[PDB]
Design a protein around this ligand. Structure first.
Ligand code: 402
Ligand code: SF4
Ligand code: SF4
Ligand code: SF4
Ligand code: SF4
Ligand code: FES
Ligand SMILES: [Mg+2]
Ligand SMILES: [Mg+2]
Ligand SMILES: [Mg+2]
Length: 581
């Protein structure tokens, strides 16, 4: 073993680990900032994790290995003055104005400033933020007056996506982060997944705000504002109201949305059942036409951008079913007026998403018909939370209410969409019933669930074997393709999610501080809310959703043909030949 003394306390251990990790395991307090995802900022270490090792001096705990004979002090005056000094140097490049800041309630940097009682040498007070701010993107925004150059976003993009779309850049002799050549992110290979935002300790990276879109529509007397939340929102937003992790707050959200003034409370899980109707029908059509195989899901816009940017030859293989968001939106401007009497032009449809990429999807030029956008606004889980708090709605004390049913009912199949493997599982439940013209009892496909990066299964559909895969994270899509796995067998149906864990880990979700991430498996705990709902629901197949069945019967007809095909689908095409390209 080794013997280690920390702040006068002897430890016997044979672990090979860092001082930071050993301390955290033994409830010894050490601060950290740039350390995340088992990486610190290798080209500009923050040194907030400074501790003192007798005989060696000041060291960074986050990457210094424990060794036999080490005597460590984490709280000497020399340590604290060094840490304090580093925080003071960061304050010198930080617009320290927490009042209006969208990370005020959970900012890692503020907590460190308070802890060490640090102060700027010179308060950073730029008079014109224009040059520091980039709001060109439909999905992301950068405010470099808040940027600590901690590198967490650069490392998170690399690890989560392997695009390296987020880079260190040299701008006029100064270091910044940004997209390739300081372009708009949208105009680069970036997936707009927002994992970089999720990694950021401060408010430097954010979602493109849609909050004014929403407030102006609510305030317009002639606008009728529909709101519909994603699967993942009901399993996560509670975290921002100090309710802890893994709490189902579906009913509270419906009540809060009514208190915010929305005119109709629907649910994107209804749209998820629509997507399955169309997609499971398409799978059965492809089986009968013998392809094109594999069919890929098309509901994740981060993956769609990944395909567009890296694998355009797969675009024809994507399912033509719109995503639950866009397929919902389409019906909100067509079906919903037909059962309400509203003028379609006066319907304003808002979604609440765990996702930044969804904002780009919604603003795609052709995502409209007859001049009416499918989706007029997308707010993130975080934006809704702020909307609720701004309205002084006592979220944690609200009673449960229900959604308006016509486009609000959902099956258990729709409910699990937010977890990796959920779309696959939901699609199979319907494709099997469709192909075998039957009502099977065994509907649980636990083989495609969980956090493994690449998940294969063999499935039997109408007395033949088919090969499916669930790709869990954009980096795993690249692994799957580059390694040749795609070619090792004939795949027939593949789910791809850009965010590892599925949408429950999307770029629009509540931030979680590094400490809690050590203690909580956020991906499993959020997904557990969804699978729980599926278990306790009467209808667990999309085509059994009674409100959906009514809609198709009275308005669309049969899925995958006629009107349904005409307006609930959307195809992506690779660019035509040109030269130069
Ligand atoms: N559109 C749509 Fe989806 C549905 O339903 C969400 O809303 Fe997702 C979630 N939660 C998000 O963002 S997108 C990718 N498919 C899995 S779930
Ligand atoms: S990023 Fe944090 S420290 Fe900076 S202004 Fe916002 S809340 Fe305050
Ligand atoms: S949005 Fe996703 S792909 Fe783009 S820079 Fe951020 S992490 Fe990378
Ligand atoms: S944007 Fe955020 S994560 Fe990226 S370097 Fe700046 S502070 Fe760190
Ligand atoms: S996995 Fe979900 S949250 Fe992540 S980019 Fe795709 S749609 Fe958005
Ligand atoms: S947290 Fe250790 S160097 Fe940044
Ligand atoms: Mg390192
Ligand atoms: Mg109104
Ligand atoms: Mg196998």
């Amino acid at each position: 073993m080794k013997t280690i003394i920390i702040n006068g306390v002897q430890f016997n251990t044979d672990e090979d680990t860092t001082i930071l990790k050993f301390a955290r395991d033994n409830n010894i307090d050490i601060s950290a900032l740039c350390f995340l995802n088992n990486c610190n900022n290798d080209i500009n270490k923050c040194e907030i994790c400074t501790v003192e090792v007798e005989g060696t001096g000041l060291v960074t705990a986050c990457d210094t290995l424990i060794e036999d004979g080490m005597i460590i002090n984490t709280n000497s005056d020399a340590v604290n003055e060094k840490i304090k000094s580093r925080i003071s140097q960061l304050l010198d490049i930080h617009e320290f104005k927490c009042g209006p800041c969208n990370r005020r309630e959970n900012c890692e940097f503020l907590k460190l400033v308070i802890k060490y009682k640090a102060r700027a040498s010179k308060p950073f007070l730029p008079k014109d933020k224009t040059e520091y701010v980039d709001e060109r993107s439909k999905s992301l925004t950068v405010d470099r007056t808040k940027c600590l150059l901690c590198g967490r976003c650069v490392n998170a993009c690399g690890k989560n996506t392997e695009t390296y779309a987020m880079k260190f850049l040299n701008k006029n002799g100064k270091t910044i982060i940004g997209a390739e050549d300081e372009k708009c992110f949208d105009d680069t290979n970036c997936l707009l997944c927002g994992q970089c935002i999720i990694a950021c300790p401060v408010a430097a990276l954010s979602e493109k705000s849609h909050m004014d879109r929403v407030k102006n529509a609510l305030n317009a007397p002639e606008k009728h504002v529909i709101v519909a939340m994603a699967p993942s929102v009901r399993a996560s937003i509670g975290e921002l109201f100090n309710m802890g992790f893994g709490v189902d707050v579906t009913g509270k959200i419906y009540t809060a949305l009514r208190q915010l003034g929305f005119d109709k409370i629907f649910d994107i899980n209804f749209g998820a059942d629509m997507t399955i109707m169309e997609e499971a029908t398409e799978l059965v059509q492809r089986i009968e036409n013998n392809g094109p195989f594999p069919m890929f899901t098309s509901c994740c816009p981060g993956w769609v951008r990944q395909a567009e940017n890296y694998y355009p030859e797969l675009l024809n293989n994507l399912s033509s079913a719109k995503s639950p968001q866009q397929i919902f939106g389409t019906a909100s401007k067509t079906y919903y007026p037909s059962i309400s009497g509203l003028d379609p032009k006066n319907v304003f449809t808002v979604t609440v998403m765990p996702c930044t990429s969804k904002k780009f999807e919604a603003d795609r030029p052709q995502m409209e018909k007859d001049g009416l956008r499918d989706i007029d606004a997308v707010i993130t889980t975080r934006e809704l939370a702020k909307m609720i708090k701004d309205a002084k709605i006592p979220f944690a004390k609200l009673e449960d209410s229900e959604a308006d049913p016509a486009m609000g009912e959902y099956s258990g199949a729709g409910a699990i969409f937010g977890a990796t493997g959920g779309v696959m599982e939901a699609a199979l439940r319907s494709a099997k019933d469709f192909a075998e013209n039957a009502e099977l009892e065994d509907i649980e496909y636990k083989q495609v669930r969980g956090l493994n990066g690449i998940k294969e299964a063999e499935v039997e559909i109408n007395n033949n074997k088919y090969n499916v895969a669930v790709i869990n994270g954009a980096s795993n899509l690249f692994k799957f393709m580059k390694s040749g796995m795609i070619n090792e067998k004939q795949y027939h149906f593949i789910e791809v999610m850009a965010c590892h864990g599925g949408c429950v880990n999307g770029g629009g979700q509540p931030h979680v501080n590094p400490k809690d991430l050590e203690k909580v498996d956020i991906k499993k705990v959020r997904a557990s809310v969804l699978y729980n709902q599926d278990e306790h629901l009467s209808k667990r197949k999309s085509h059994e959703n009674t409100a959906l069945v009514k809609m198709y019967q009275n308005y669309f007809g049969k899925p995958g043909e006629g009107r349904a095909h005409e307006i609930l689908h959307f195809k992506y095409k690779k660019s035509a030949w040109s030269h130069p390209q």
